[PDB]
Structure 1
Amino acid sequence: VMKQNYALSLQIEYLSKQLQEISDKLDVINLNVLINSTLTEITPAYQRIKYVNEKFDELTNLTELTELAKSVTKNDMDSFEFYLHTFHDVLIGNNLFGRSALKTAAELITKDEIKTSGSEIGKVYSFLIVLTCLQAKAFLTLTACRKLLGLSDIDYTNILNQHLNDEKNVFRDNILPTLSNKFSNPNYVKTIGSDNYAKVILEAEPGYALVGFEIINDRIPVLKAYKAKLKQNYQVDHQSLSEIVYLDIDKLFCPKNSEQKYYTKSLTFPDGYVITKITFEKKLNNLRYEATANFYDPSTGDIDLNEKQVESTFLQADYISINVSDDDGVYMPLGVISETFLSPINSFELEVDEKSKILTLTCKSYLREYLLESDLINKETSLIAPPNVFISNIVENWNIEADNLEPWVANNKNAYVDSTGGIEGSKALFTQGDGEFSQFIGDKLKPNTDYIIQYTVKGKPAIYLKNKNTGYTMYEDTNGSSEEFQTIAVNYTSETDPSQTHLVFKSQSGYEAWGDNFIILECKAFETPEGPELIKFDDWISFGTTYIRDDVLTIDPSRGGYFRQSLKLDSYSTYNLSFSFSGLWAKVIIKNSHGVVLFEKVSQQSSYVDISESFTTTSNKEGFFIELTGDSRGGFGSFRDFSMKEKFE
């Protein structure tokens, strides 16, 4: 009876879940009904405005254009001004039942199952900007039509400004203090990393601050991070934009075969602070990150270095583990992880879900304050869209889209530019025979620095990165007879102060070749540190009767003879202690003057039994001991070859 009652409880819980799903479906249906309510009032005016704007685009064919202008400028019951007024009233909410279209559109955009670019504020503001630009284009079209007909000029600036101000005020007063300023990655992709050290330092200059990140799933993953100055009211300076590129994204967010520990903590900061440094460090299957934020003054716009808070996850014990096998994989973040418009970041987070093995980089932005103080008070605004393409590359005209290609020079007429070739039709460089294209890139080529030589080609290309003089080729592009365009991202490291190196593009003898999208980025990937040497044969403090000979330091049993050497450990680290004892009951204990023992290995009979075990350090680096001691009373100790190096870092 108890078992069947429990089963009934489970069935009731299932019914409750079904009821919750039904309620969500009802909410969706009601939202769609409100959408229909908006559409049945807004469809014809919007359609006509869009058609008129599309038609009158060439001037901002004479007979039809004049006829259309006369039809639009005609002042009748059903006129273009009438449709503009109806559109404005519908957006404001001056309809029969006093329901505004802006609220319904904001509800539809917010309550959408698909996440595309960022927070709700960005998308709603983008929709409002699209509507306002459509209205402005319609008013400009009407003014141009009136000018073309040679009719009396009517100043439509006043009515257009009134409409835009009313719409912006309605938005700000009604639907602005309801939206959330939280944005996350739009997409997820399976990836298998490596169980090796990977440190990423997304730092910035003292006058700079991070304004967003971007992850692109290519042959080599990237971590494009945007940093720029702040002018006033959290505005991002366009001229100061800069990018940081990393390549170990897969090796950082995914384990190979030996688990990974994720230390999650919402790094929220108080209002007025802007994140200026994000550092990741996966020592050994343990991802821990910290954030550095500096105080920002909206009135002036100075990122002061005197006030600085740090929200670090390095000194916590709680963690989340994700087991990854060959069958499955953890969904690393993939997409443009930033606001719809570049803005300083307030909080950073790394959410981990064990059920689905997904990672989300939820963050926050100061877009609301900038919108309030720059655009919604009838001031002048300037928002920056995220860079969809690399702009830190040292290859001028990376994709051939503009004419008069000066950086690229052709040796002769065999090689030319093919408009049809390349990505869609972006005027790819075509090489057929001995002809080739060249471009000097030694001006921006920093000595002994890493570089990315990602490019896209078709046919039989050859992009040998030679030094012009002496014919020294620093890169090889042998083979590669693939037909369809594909990425050829290959890591590269520059030599010592070359200062003379030009990138050339040519086709191998015989087959032809097409080339486009030549980008050379500046990566700053790090490497595993060698490790410290905490224990050394220089500070072996001895007590009692001790006999140190060569490197065979002995321990005297049954008396006070014992060695000791304090060492500086870390909070969370792993150390490999290698030694070789040769004494009866000879042990190397690690005390902390409190009874806590971190390592204990005792010899049994004799001989130098080499032991290379490892131990952790818990969460207290108050200073430990490497004391050599023998609890026996007979055979003297004999310890040789001491070494304790931290694992990886």
Structure 2
Amino acid sequence: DYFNGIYGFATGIKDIMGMIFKTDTGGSNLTLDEILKNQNLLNDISGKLDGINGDLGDLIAQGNLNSELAKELLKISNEQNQMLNHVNAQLNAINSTLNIYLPKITSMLNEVMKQNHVLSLQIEFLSKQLQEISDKLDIINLNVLINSTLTEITPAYQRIKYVNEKFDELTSTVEKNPKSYQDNVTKEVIENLNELTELAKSVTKNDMDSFEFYLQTFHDVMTGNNLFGRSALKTASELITKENVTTRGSEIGKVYNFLIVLTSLQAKAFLTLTACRKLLGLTDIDYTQIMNHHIDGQKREFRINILPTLSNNFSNPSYSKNRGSDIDDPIVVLEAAPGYALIGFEILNDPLPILKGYQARLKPNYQVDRESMSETIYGDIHKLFCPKQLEQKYYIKDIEFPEGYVITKIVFEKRLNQLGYEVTANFYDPSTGSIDLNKVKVESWKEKSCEEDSCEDEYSIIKAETDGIYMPLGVVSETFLTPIYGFGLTVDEKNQKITLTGKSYLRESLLETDLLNNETYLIASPDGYISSIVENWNITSDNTGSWRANNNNAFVDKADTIKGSSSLYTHKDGEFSQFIGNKLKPKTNYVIQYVIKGRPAIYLKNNKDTLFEDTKNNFSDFQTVTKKFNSGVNPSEIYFLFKNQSEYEAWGNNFIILEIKSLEFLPQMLKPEDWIPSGNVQMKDGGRLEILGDGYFKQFIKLENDSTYHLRLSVKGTGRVSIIDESKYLLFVNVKDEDLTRVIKNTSSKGECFIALEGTYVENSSTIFSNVSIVKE
């Protein structure tokens, strides 16, 4: 969805305050002292004693009686009236409370709970994100300045977080007015009474020589007004900018995220304080002024003396050793739509090495639209990034366009292990969010020698080791998706690892909107996918939409196994159905992912073939799994079939399936169609040209004198290859199972030559070729 930034969050908390600030208390002195469990018991005493006292008082008021007897009875009347009066006073306090106050207070509290929950959904993400950041940071070589802020802040932070947690949860677990805690029977007045008493005790403890001291000093330490003025913000900046912290997002991303965490903490605490006050008696204190002032102070700090020092450069978070190829010329294009813009990348490998690219339209001041977003998946990216036992040329540049431009299309080129690329940017307007389509800039070469002389040099090379090259792995994006104006590759072959890097507009993307208190619209980096062919794959709304269950044991049930999320539940016959055939293009790969608990029965069936089925694994706690498959020759009828099992209990949701864009290649001289078989030989889909025994393939191929040619191919099954010009062997090599790498030098093929793809000559032989590549140098 959206994250409306710290200013919008503060406005939300201020509106919650303005709501609770007004409603009512009637004074009503909610002191816990009231026994509050004898509203029944005292009533009996009150009634009986009232009757007795009335009878006796009327007997006296009859008059006409022995004088001293009258005095005696009058004294008895006085005593009884005193006892009864204090008793009914206690009862009247209790009952006045349990009729006037608890309904009012319960209503206001129930109201404050929901909006609190809503605002907590605005930072749920960054919570876990800062948890992860804390996991991967090391404080070696810290200065005394660090220990300074640590001891200056840690108790206040401890207690502020603790109180926010405790109160916020107690807002929920307090019975609401349905019971009204009334005298109804009992044990409602044990448990709901215990919880109400605990709420009372907590809120009471918030008015003393503490917790308006803790809040204030916390704010001060943040702003950096302590005994020698070292804002914890700055020391956190220093700690984060220290390396070994290579995770998603750049410096600015991480520090701003930190400040989001802390500011949300402070605002939550202010809300809690005001709620406590109103929950007690009187003297409401409009804290909104102080809260806004403190938030603006911390933001001014962050803006002035930290932000201009940080980098928007962001790298892949991890690496991975992988075996790629050399006989191929893979070319990859990531071209956003004409009205779109690149907004980050991601590399996954678990189904297969896959680069993913997001794209979207732009809103002013470098803000992204939630919709119009799109994820695109690409194929064997390792084959572009990884060799197989041969060196790799990597041209490395810090390509960056001028300000106002946005990287709009990144095309990759690997030509005979020379890895360059193409970065093209368009013009964009921050004031209107509009991206121009008629003012572009291009970058064809990827070094500094071409940067200063337009001459080809200054790449870097990697000598292919055995196990595999450390290729990029993980997410390539800022913590908040953002159009980038800088990009580059910075491989360090010293240890055989590659690294991508870009420069983000995040700085200016926020400096115009948030730190100036305007409507901010960011988007947290999507941890997983965002779209799917399965419509409403994210079943949560208790509605199936295109989903369909043909059995009442298959139901939607937002609280399938828990109210936290829905996961289509099926037991012993439960089947969730969805026609999906119309969207899967034939002969195309697809990756599948879903979070499943139990052992469900999953099917991709067109009533004739089940393109995929998994019915084996049993998952206690919603294990997600990912598999792949290629669409059949005609999947136009395939359904989605979430069945339960033969019989079992099943859970499952977020059934994501996406097209894996097949990897393409550069042109060559060879053509998979110009081949000439010679009996007992059959070519395959990938121009494989398998020798089915005794026979061969050939294809006439024209050469020139002053041109160099690189012949590359691999075979499945032993065989041979021969380039005979007309009688002379321009080449003749025996190959068993390996990648041919011969490079024919300057030689004018007389007339025409051809490659006699002759494998071995026995009956049971199968010499299958892979990549008939005669790429000319």
Matched position secondary structure for 1:639: coil
Matched position secondary structure for 2:370: coil
Q: Which residue of 2 aligns with 1:590?
A: 705
Query: Structure 1 residue 579: deviation in Å?
Result: 6.0
Q: Which of 242, 251, 261 matches 2:374? A: 242
Query: Structure 1 residue 176: deviation in Å?
Result: 0.9
Of residues 340-349 and 297-306 in structure 1, the stretch that sits farther from structure 2 once superposed is 297-306
Q: Which of 364, 387, 394 matches 1:232? A: 364
Q: Which of 528, 546, 556 matches 1:389? A: 528
Q: Which residue of 2 aligns with 1:518?
A: 655
1:231-268 C-alpha deviation (Å, 9 max, x unpaired): 11212222222111113122221112333222222212
Change (3 A) 1:509 1:88: closer
* 1:368 partnered with 2:504: no
1:425-458 C-alpha deviation (Å, 9 max, x unpaired): 9665566655422123356545775432345668
Q: Map residues 190-269 of structure 1 onto 2, 5 A cutoff.
A: 190-195=321-326, 196-269=328-401
Q: Which residue of 1 aligns with 2:277?
A: 146
Matched position secondary structure for 1:353: coil
Residue identity in the other structure for 2:154: T
Change (3 A) 1:29 1:354: closer
Of residues 167-176 and 488-497 in structure 1, the stretch that sits farther from structure 2 once superposed is 488-497
Residue identity in the other structure for 1:452: V
Residue identity in the other structure for 1:119: S
Q: Which residue of 1 aligns with 2:17?
A: none
Looking at structure 2, the residues matched to 365 and 442 of structure 1 have their Cα atoms a distance apart, in angstroms, of 40
Q: Which residue of 2 aligns with 1:572?
A: none
1:459–1:480 CA contact under 8 A, matched in 2 = no
Query: Structure 1 residue 367: deviation in Å?
Result: 0.9
Q: Which of 640, 644, 653 matches 1:503? A: 640
Change (3 A) 1:280 1:138: same
Of residues 394-403 and 184-193 in structure 1, the stretch that sits farther from structure 2 once superposed is 394-403
TM-score w.r.t. length of structure 2: 0.62
* 1:272 partnered with 2:404: yes
Q: Which of 273, 292, 309 matches 1:178? A: 309
TM-score w.r.t. length of structure 1: 0.74
Looking at structure 1, the residues matched to 592 and 141 of structure 2 have their Cα atoms a distance apart, in angstroms, of 52
Q: Map residues 160-179 of structure 1 onto 2, 5 A cutoff.
A: 160-179=291-310
Q: Which of 196, 209, 215 matches 1:62? A: 196
Change (3 A) 1:41 1:292: same
Looking at structure 1, the residues matched to 382 and 482 of structure 2 have their Cα atoms a distance apart, in angstroms, of 26
Looking at structure 2, the residues matched to 200 and 338 of structure 1 have their Cα atoms a distance apart, in angstroms, of 19
* Percent identical residues: 59
Looking at structure 2, the residues matched to 49 and 607 of structure 1 have their Cα atoms a distance apart, in angstroms, of 87
1:230–1:237 CA contact under 8 A, matched in 2 = yes
Q: Which residue of 2 aligns with 1:50?
A: 161
1:451–1:491 CA contact under 8 A, matched in 2 = yes
Residue identity in the other structure for 2:643: K
Q: Map residues 22-37 of structure 1 onto 2, 5 A cutoff.
A: 31-37=142-148
Change (3 A) 1:512 1:69: closer
Matched position secondary structure for 2:156: helix
Looking at structure 1, the residues matched to 420 and 656 of structure 2 have their Cα atoms a distance apart, in angstroms, of 32
Q: Which residue of 2 aligns with 1:647?
A: 775
Q: Which of 231, 255, 258 matches 1:124? A: 255
Looking at structure 1, the residues matched to 339 and 201 of structure 2 have their Cα atoms a distance apart, in angstroms, of 57
* 1:437 partnered with 2:576: yes
5+ residue gaps in structure 1? 1-26, 538-575, 581-587, 592-596, 600-605, 619-624, 629-637
Query: Structure 1 residue 337: deviation in Å?
Result: 1.4
Q: Map residues 410-425 of structure 1 onto 2, 5 A cutoff.
A: 410-413=549-552
Query: Structure 1 residue 408: deviation in Å?
Result: 3.7
Change (3 A) 1:642 1:422: farther
Query: Structure 1 residue 358: deviation in Å?
Result: 0.6
Residue identity in the other structure for 2:362: L
* 1:292 partnered with 2:424: yes
Residue identity in the other structure for 1:229: R
Q: Which residue of 1 aligns with 2:460?
A: 320
Looking at structure 1, the residues matched to 531 and 516 of structure 2 have their Cα atoms a distance apart, in angstroms, of 35
Looking at structure 2, the residues matched to 445 and 105 of structure 1 have their Cα atoms a distance apart, in angstroms, of 49
Query: Structure 1 residue 403: deviation in Å?
Result: 4.1
Residue identity in the other structure for 2:608: Y
Matched position secondary structure for 1:298: coil
Q: Which residue of 2 aligns with 1:632?
A: none
Matched position secondary structure for 1:347: strand
Q: Map residues 570-581 of structure 1 onto 2, 5 A cutoff.
A: none
Q: Which of 634, 658, 664 matches 1:527? A: 664
Residue identity in the other structure for 1:63: T
1:419–1:427 CA contact under 8 A, matched in 2 = yes
Looking at structure 2, the residues matched to 477 and 30 of structure 1 have their Cα atoms a distance apart, in angstroms, of 54
Change (3 A) 1:454 1:134: closer
5+ residue gaps in structure 2? 1-137, 173-194, 447-454, 675-697, 710-724, 733-740, 756-771
Change (3 A) 1:646 1:579: closer
1:212–1:338 CA contact under 8 A, matched in 2 = yes
Matched position secondary structure for 1:239: coil
Residue identity in the other structure for 1:95: N
Residue identity in the other structure for 1:320: S
Query: Structure 1 residue 42: deviation in Å?
Result: 1.5
Looking at structure 1, the residues matched to 773 and 386 of structure 2 have their Cα atoms a distance apart, in angstroms, of 26
Query: Structure 1 residue 307: deviation in Å?
Result: 1.3
2:542–2:566 CA contact under 8 A, matched in 1 = no
1:578–1:611 CA contact under 8 A, matched in 2 = no
1:273–1:293 CA contact under 8 A, matched in 2 = yes
Looking at structure 2, the residues matched to 598 and 441 of structure 1 have their Cα atoms a distance apart, in angstroms, of 50
2:600–2:649 CA contact under 8 A, matched in 1 = yes
Query: Structure 1 residue 368: deviation in Å?
Result: 0.9
Q: Which residue of 2 aligns with 1:550?
A: none
Change (3 A) 1:351 1:421: farther
Looking at structure 2, the residues matched to 158 and 324 of structure 1 have their Cα atoms a distance apart, in angstroms, of 63
Looking at structure 1, the residues matched to 773 and 385 of structure 2 have their Cα atoms a distance apart, in angstroms, of 26
Query: Structure 1 residue 40: deviation in Å?
Result: 1.9
* 1:91 partnered with 2:222: yes
Looking at structure 1, the residues matched to 418 and 560 of structure 2 have their Cα atoms a distance apart, in angstroms, of 46
Q: Which residue of 2 aligns with 1:23?
A: none
* 1:491 partnered with 2:632: no
2:708–2:776 CA contact under 8 A, matched in 1 = no
Query: Structure 1 residue 319: deviation in Å?
Result: 3.5
* 1:609 partnered with 2:742: no
Residue identity in the other structure for 1:107: E
Change (3 A) 1:402 1:648: farther
Change (3 A) 1:115 1:235: same
1:503-532 C-alpha deviation (Å, 9 max, x unpaired): 113366578876555211123223346645
Residue identity in the other structure for 2:299: K
Matched position secondary structure for 1:335: strand
Q: Map residues 553-572 of structure 1 onto 2, 5 A cutoff.
A: none
1:444-500 C-alpha deviation (Å, 9 max, x unpaired): 545775432345668876533223xxx2335143785688957341232365682x4
Q: Which residue of 2 aligns with 1:301?
A: 433
Matched position secondary structure for 2:611: coil
Query: Structure 1 residue 384: deviation in Å?
Result: 0.8
Residue identity in the other structure for 1:477: E
Question: By percentage of residues, which structure has more helix?
Answer: 2
1:578–1:610 CA contact under 8 A, matched in 2 = no
Looking at structure 2, the residues matched to 494 and 518 of structure 1 have their Cα atoms a distance apart, in angstroms, of 19
1:177-226 C-alpha deviation (Å, 9 max, x unpaired): 11111110111222222333322211101111111112234132322211
Change (3 A) 1:63 1:350: same
Of residues 175-184 and 97-106 in structure 1, the stretch that sits farther from structure 2 once superposed is 97-106
Change (3 A) 1:527 1:371: closer
Change (3 A) 1:335 1:648: farther
Query: Structure 1 residue 272: deviation in Å?
Result: 1.7
1:342–1:384 CA contact under 8 A, matched in 2 = yes
Change (3 A) 1:509 1:191: same
1:194–1:251 CA contact under 8 A, matched in 2 = yes
Query: Structure 1 residue 173: deviation in Å?
Result: 0.9
